[PDB]
C-alpha cells in the first residue's frame, strides 16, 4: 500500500534510496525530475534492477495528438502506467486511454491535486473530472492526501472497485492512516528519500499502516 | 526464485490456485492451455488481480512476419515477456526482439528443452542457439532442470549477468536446489497446481530453497 515517489535527480542517489527501501514497496513512481536528468532509459533500468512496477508521473496535459505521442514513448520506455491530468478534457484523456489499450498498459487519472493552489481552479472541477473518468472507463485514479474529505468524495464517485492512489503524505502534511481510509495506496516521496535513513522512514510508515 | 507455470485450463481453478500461492511468487507463466481455453483477456485479469509479472509461454516458432504478429498481440494483451524458440533461427528471434523493443517488453530465449525428446535434435543445436542469443543481445534465457550439466553449459555461454529460468522441476524429475545452482529461478507447474494443497507444495519448495 506504499508507493515511492522517486524524485531525486541523480541516478546514483535514486538507485541507492530505491534499493534501500525495496523490501517495503513494489511500485515506484518515476517522474520528470529523474527522467529529464538521467534520460528515459532510467525507467527500464529500475524495472529490471528492482523488479518493481513503474508508474510514470508525467501528468500529461496536452492536446490529444501530443498526449498520444508522450504516452507511446512512455510505454515504449517500459512504464507500466502513466498519470494523466483530467482538467484538459475528455478527448485528451481518451487519447491516452487509446495508447494504453494498444500497448496493454494503464492510465491513472489525476482528479484533484494536493497543494494549496489546487483549490483555485482544480478543486471546483474535480468531481466532474472524476465523473468524466468513470464515463470513459478509467479504473485508476489519483486524489489528495492533504484533503481527506475530498478523497472521500472522490472514492464515492469512482466506487470501491476502482484503484485510488494518493500523494501528499508526510512532507505536504497528509497522514498515512487517514489517507488509507479512502485510498488503496499512498504515495510518499520526501519523507522517505530525504530521510537520514530511508529504510527506517519507510518501515515507520509501514508500521503505522 | 519461483515462477508458477499456470497450465490449468479452466479460469476458476486457475484463479483459485494462483491466489492460494500468491505469497510464494510474484511471477506467473501463462501459456496456451489457459489462453486457448479462456481467451487472451485472462493475461490482463491475472496481472490486475494478483499484481504479478506475466510471462507468456508461447514459445514462438514461426517465420519472422508471423512471430511479429504474435508478439504484438501478446504484449497488447498485457504480458511482460514472451518465450521464443531459438531453433527456427536468428531472423525469427530478431523479429520478436524488435517488437519487444517497440513495446518496452522482454524476450526469453528457449535454448534446450526439458523432455526426453529434446535430446533428438534440440540438444545438439543448443549451445549454438545460446551463442546466437548472446550475439543478438538476448538477456533472458530458458534451460532444462532435467539436465543440470546442460544448464551449467548454458550458464557458461550466457554469462552471470543474463537471467536464466528453468522448467522441469518436480513432475519431470528436476530438483529445485540443484537447478538453482545455475538458474536464477525455477518454473514449477504440476507439482504445485495438481497438489492437494498448492500453498503447502509451494511453501515446501520455498523451504528447501
Ligand atoms: O496532486 C498531486 C499530484 C502529484 N504529486 C506528486 O507526488 C509526489 C509527492 O511527493 P512528496 O510530497 O511525498 O515528496 C511528487 O512526485 C509530486 O510531484 C503531488 O504531490 N500532488
Ligand atoms: O523445455 C521446456 C519448455 C517449456 N516447458 C513448460 O514449462 C512448464 C513446466 O510444467 P511442469 O512440468 O512443472 O508441470 C509447462 O508449462 C511446460 O509447457 C517445459 O516443461 N520444458
Ligand atoms: Cl504524479
Ligand atoms: Cl508537469
Ligand atoms: Cl514455456
Ligand atoms: Cl507450442
Burial class (CB in 10 A: 0-12, 13-18, 19+), B144: buried
Q: Supply the range of the domain harboring residue B168.
A: 1-209
Contact B51/A78, CB-based, under 8 Å?
A: no
Which among A106, A131, A114 is positioned nearest to A166, based on CA atoms? A114
Is the minimum distance from the CB of B4 to ligand 2 under 6 angstroms? no
CA distance B141 to B136: 12
CA distance A5 to B6: 33
Q: What is the DSSP letter of A119?
A: G
Residue nearest to atom 2 of ligand 2 (CA): B113
Number of helices (H), then strands (E), in chain A: 10, 8
Residue nearest to atom 13 of ligand 1 (CA): A189
Which among B178, B182, B187 is positioned nearest to B209, based on CA atoms? B178
Q: Do the Cβ atoms of B97 and B68 come closer than 8 Å?
A: no
Judging contacts by C-beta atoms under 8 Å, the chain B residues touching residue A51 are: 26, 53
CA distance A194 to A35: 19
Q: How many domains does chain A have?
A: 1
The coordinates were experimentally obtained by: X-ray
CATH of the domain at A31: 3.20.20.70
SS3 A140: strand
Is the minimum distance from the CB of A8 to ligand 1 under 6 angstroms? no
B147 CA: distance to closest CA in chain A (Å): 28
DSSP string, chain B: -EEEEE--SSHHHHHHHHHHHGGG-SEEEE-HHHHHHH-THHHHHHHHHH--EEEEEEEE-S-HHHHHHHHHHHHHTT-SEEEEESTT-HHHHHHHHHHHHHHT-EEEEE-S-SSGGGGTTHHHHHHHHHHHHHHHT--EEE--TT-HHHHHHHHHHH-SSSEEEE--BSTTSB-HHHHTTT-SEEEE-HHHHTSSSHHHHHHHHHHH-
- Which three three-digit cell numbers place residue B88? 527456427
Chain A residues whose C-beta is within 8 A of a chain B C-beta are: 26, 44, 51, 53, 75-79, 101-105
Atom of ligand 1 nearest to the CA of A188: 13
Q: How many CA atoms lie within 13 A of A177 on its CB side?
A: 4
Which among A37, A31, A133 is positioned nearest to A85, based on CA atoms? A133
Q: Do the Cβ atoms of B18 and B46 come closer than 8 Å?
A: yes
Which among B33, B23, B88, B37 is positioned nearest to B56, based on CA atoms? B33
Give the CA angle between residues A17, A76, A27 to the nearest 5°.
Answer: 30
A48 as an active site residue: the answer is no
In terms of phi and psi (left: phi > 0; alpha: psi -120 to 50; beta: otherwise), the region of B129 is alpha
Interface test with B, best of A104, A106, A138, A139 (most B CBs within 10 A): A104
Contact B44/A76, CB-based, under 8 Å?
A: no
In angstroms, how far is CA B37 from the centroid of its own chain?
Answer: 19
CA distance B38 to A54: 28
Burial class (CB in 10 A: 0-12, 13-18, 19+), A86: buried
Contact A76/B103, CB-based, under 8 Å?
A: yes
Amino acid at each position: 500500500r506504499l508507493i515511492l515517489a522517486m524524485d531525486l535527480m541523480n541516478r546514483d542517489d535514486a538507485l541507492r534510496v530505491t534499493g534501500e527501501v525495496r523490501e517495503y514497496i513494489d511500485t515506484v513512481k518515476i517522474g520528470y525530475p529523474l527522467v529529464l536528468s538521467e534520460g528515459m532509459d532510467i525507467i527500464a533500468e529500475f524495472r529490471k534492477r528492482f523488479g518493481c512496477r513503474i508508474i510514470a508521473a508525467f501528468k500529461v496535459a496536452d492536446i490529444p495528438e501530443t498526449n498520444e505521442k508522450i504516452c507511446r514513448a512512455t510505454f515504449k520506455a517500459g512504464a507500466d502506467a502513466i498519470i494523466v491530468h483530467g482538467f484538459p478534457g475528455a478527448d485528451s484523456v481518451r487519447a491516452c486511454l487509446n495508447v494504453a489499450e494498444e500497448m496493454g498498459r494503464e492510465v491513472f487519472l489525476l482528479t484533484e491535486m494536493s497543494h494549496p493552489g489546487a483549490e483555485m481552479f482544480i478543486q471546483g472541477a474535480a468531481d466532474e473530472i472524476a465523473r468524466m473518468g468513470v464515463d470513459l472507463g478509467v479504473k485508476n485514479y489519483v486524489g489528495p492526501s492533504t484533503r481527506p474529505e475530498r478523497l472521500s468524495r472522490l472514492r464515492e464517485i469512482i466506487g470501491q472497485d476502482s484503484f485510488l492512489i494518493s500523494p501528499g503524505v508526510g512532507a505536504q502534511g497528509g497522514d498515512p492512516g487517514e489517507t488509507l481510509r479512502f485510498a488503496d495506496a499512498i504515495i510518499v516521496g520526501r519523507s522517505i528519500y530525504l530521510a537520514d535513513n530511508p529504510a527506517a522512514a519507510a518501515a515507520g510508515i509501514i508500521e503505522s499502516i
